[PDB]
């Protein structure tokens, strides 16, 4: 039946993506619950052309850039200021879907050798 | 005057933090407008103990983890699926101030050799 075939195609898709390594952590997307089989749907657009829809839940860095910067500020001052002090640091209060789907943005990323290297190794 | 002294102390603070390297980009925090002199304030809490307040504007990654993951999904499928397809990928729709100020969270970060290495090199 059509439904069975679309189920089989979604499983095909899932089996390819499930073992991709996370860019930062030593585990696969499936192990980190970034994807699961139910997160994929396949439909037939026209005869023998399929649409694949994936919803994924990205991992977050163990230590974000903003956090690293804040630590640098605190550690530098703590070690190098010549007076006794307390410090309060505040993040100043003064499209990803687009980056991963737009054909031009995808190509631009894959033309950066640094990003291409990361992506190609994660999927290897 | 008190005001002059606090201005001089804030400049002291600024001169230490302005040349810290960004964790990812080849430029200093000042060059990237992560900090500027006006973003620092110093007050005297008690005699010879000062409070330093900094507001900073973090840089963002040129390519976030979520974007890298989405690229991996697309590139893997584009290269390895055995059928013609279009793909739509969606981020599923199903405290930093705390990490950089809380004494315990700061210490925990600085005990991770990986993070300590990054921080110590950025401030060197």
Q: CB neighbours (10 Å) of residue B12?
A: 18
Instruction: Please choose, from the candidates A86, A23, A29, the residue with its C-alpha nearest in 3D space to the C-alpha of residue A57.
Output: A29
Task: Look up residue B20 and give its DSSP letter.
Answer: P
Tell me how far apart the alpha carbons of residues A121 and A109 are, in angstroms, rounded to a whole number. 15
Residue A44 C-alpha, separation from nearest chain B C-alpha, in angstroms:
9
Tell me how far apart the alpha carbons of residues A53 and A36 are, in angstroms, rounded to a whole number. 13
Provide the domain limits for residue A34.
1-124
For residues B90 and A52, the answer to whether their CB atoms sit within 8 Å is no
Tokens matching residue A35:
């994807």
Rg (CA), chain A: 21
Long-range CB pairs of B44-51 (<8 Å, 24+ gap) are B44/B2, B44/B6, B45/A86, B48/A83, B48/A84, B49/A84, B49/A85, B49/A86, B50/A83, B50/A84, B50/A85, B50/A86, B50/B9, B51/A85, B51/A86, B51/A87, B51/A88
Q: Does A29 touch chain B (CB under 8 A)?
A: yes
Instruction: Give the count of alpha carbons within 13 A of A88, CB side only.
Output: 9
Tokens matching residue B99:
């990490």
Rg (CA), chain B: 21
* Residue of A68, A79, A99, A114 to mutate, testing the B interface (most B Cβ within 10 Å of its Cβ): A68
Q: A 72-111 residues with CB below 8 A of B?
A: 72-77, 79-94, 96-97, 99-101, 106, 109-110
> Hey, which residues does B41 pair with through a beta bridge?
B53
Give residue B115's region: left, alpha or beta (phi > 0; psi -120 to 50): alpha
Tell me how far apart the alpha carbons of residues A2 and B81 are, in angstroms, rounded to a whole number. 19
For residue B27, which residues of chain A lie inside 8 Å, CB to CB?
Answer: none
> Hey, which residues does A46 pair with through a beta bridge?
A49
Instruction: Give the count of alpha carbons within 13 A of B58, CB side only.
Output: 21
For residues B41 and B12, the answer to whether their CB atoms sit within 8 Å is no
Tokens matching residue A56:
């994924």
DSSP chain A: -HHHHHHHHHHHHHHHHTTPBPSSSSSBTTTTTS--GGGEEEEEEETTEEEEEEEE-----SS-HHHHHHHHHHHHHHHH-SSEEEEEEEE----HHHHHH-HHHHHHHHHSHHHHHHHHHHH-
Tell me how far apart the alpha carbons of residues B124 and A113 are, in angstroms, rounded to a whole number. 28
Q: How many domains does chain B have?
A: 1
């Amino acid at each position: 039946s059509n439904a069975r075939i679309m189920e089989e195609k979604a499983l095909e898709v899932y089996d390819l993506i499930r073992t991709i390594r996370d860019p930062e952590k030593p585990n696969t997307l499936e192990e980190l619950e970034v994807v699961s089989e139910s997160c994929v749907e396949v439909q037939e657009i026209n005869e023998e052309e399929y649409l694949v829809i994936i919803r994924f839940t990205p991992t977050v860095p163990h230590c974000s850039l903003a956090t690293l910067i804040g630590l640098c500020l605190r550690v530098k001052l703590q070690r190098c200021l010549p007076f006794k002090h307390k410090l309060e640091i505040y993040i100043s209060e003064g499209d990803i879907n687009k980056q991963i789907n737009d054909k031009e943005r995808v190509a631009a990323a894959m033309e950066n050798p640094n990003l291409r290297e990361i992506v190609e190794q994660c999927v290897l």
